[PDB]
């Protein structure tokens, strides 16, 4: 019901799936044994790594030999198995079934059309069907959002979690999101939400580490 | 525990995510009222379809009024919500991570590099690009591994994360990839096949891979 030894994360602090399972466990009060893994010096590429995750990815999960990785895999493992109730991460079937459709949508839709916008930009201009298909992914989260206070329904989730590591990241890309309504005031809701689990530590600051690229 | 009525849903015969869902609830024993929707005509595009599922994608699953779209979240709701046990997605927090590692794995790795390396070919009549191809088959290779002393992706017992991923098997299979030299798929592919059949993977699956092959 607590782990027998600190959960350890091979990470790094600008990775936004790194981020997005350091904010979830802060939530969930669990104190991770962070481990830096420079994917630049090739640290995911030792024949040790290899054997724990041969997809070589990070953030990678270590609870008392369990390996996981997957960041949103690692976000509802951690609740599923350490939350003090469900509220993260509810068990009724229906509510469940709503988060892990935008859990969904996160990785295959909004991160997806993230990476292809700005990872031409904060390494080597924006394409334009590639800034096309962000906005509507944009569009798609604010209709997401209407009529409920966030993402999944009345309160916060392992999804909103996720997808706002995103939207810091776009803020701190000077991308004005303003003009869709919904984002604007879940955003603002959310990082006030998060304010007292590392927001600033985690969140604010691997944003402007990627940031310092632009 | 069971629906009050049979789930709705919207979908067409050769979709892969619809091929997943349709085949979960085979083997959960659910009937779909299936309700072709045709993509070419627009008919995810109305004013209703839109206030259903504002992503206009399919599959969406109509439970009663209970709406939902995105395959893996389908395929898991329905074993939550109307298995007769939780085999095909067990509640034990360390089985369901590495079912939930896998499935994230078949969107974000698997089925998006088999989606950048076959829809140029399939539906713009582009060529066979091998930098694609390399990428896909890297994931081929993490899948080979995967399966390194289990016979099914997450283990002892097959689950929605075999059913998912062995939708993109038989297409790549229909389309005249040979992945022999991948034993572990081979034999994985070979085993999951034979558990599928009693719960239509002829009628779903293979029908499905050949109609998309037909574009070849
Ligand atoms: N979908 C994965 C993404 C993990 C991922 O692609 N991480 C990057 C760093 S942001 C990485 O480890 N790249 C190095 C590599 O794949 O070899 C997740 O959410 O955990
Ligand atoms: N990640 C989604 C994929 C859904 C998807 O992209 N479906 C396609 C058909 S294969 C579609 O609805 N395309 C039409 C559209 O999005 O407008 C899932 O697993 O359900």
Not at 32 to 60: A, C, D, R, S, V
Not at 92 to 102: G, K, V, Y
Request: charged content about 20%.
């Amino acid at each position: 019901h607590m782990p027998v030894q600190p959960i350890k994360l091979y990470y790094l602090p600008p990775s936004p799936p790194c981020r997005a399972v350091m904010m979830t466990a802060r939530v969930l009060e669990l104190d991770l044994h962070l481990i830096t893994t420079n994917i630049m010096n090739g640290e995911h590429m030792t024949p040790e790594y290899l054997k724990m995750n041969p997809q070589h990815t990070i953030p990678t999960m270590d609870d008392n030999g369990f390996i996981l990785w997957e960041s949103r895999a690692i976000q509802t493992y951690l609740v599923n198995a350490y939350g003090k109730d469900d509220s993260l991460y509810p068990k009724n079937p229906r509510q469940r079934a709503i988060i892990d459709q935008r859990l969904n949508f996160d990785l295959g839709t909004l991160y997806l059309r993230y990476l292809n916008l700005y990872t031409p930009i904060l390494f080597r201009a924006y394409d334009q069907e590639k800034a096309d298909k962000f906005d509507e992914a944009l569009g798609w989260l604010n209709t997401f959002l209407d009529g409920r206070p966030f993402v999944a329904g009345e309160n916060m989730t392992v999804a909103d979690i996720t997808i706002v590591v995103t939207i810091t990241n776009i803020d701190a890309f000077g991308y004005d999101f303003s003009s869709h309504e919904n984002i604007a005031k879940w955003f603002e809701r959310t990082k006030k939400m998060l304010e007292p689990y590392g927001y600033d530590e985690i969140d604010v600051t691997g944003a402007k580490m990627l940031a310092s690229f632009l």
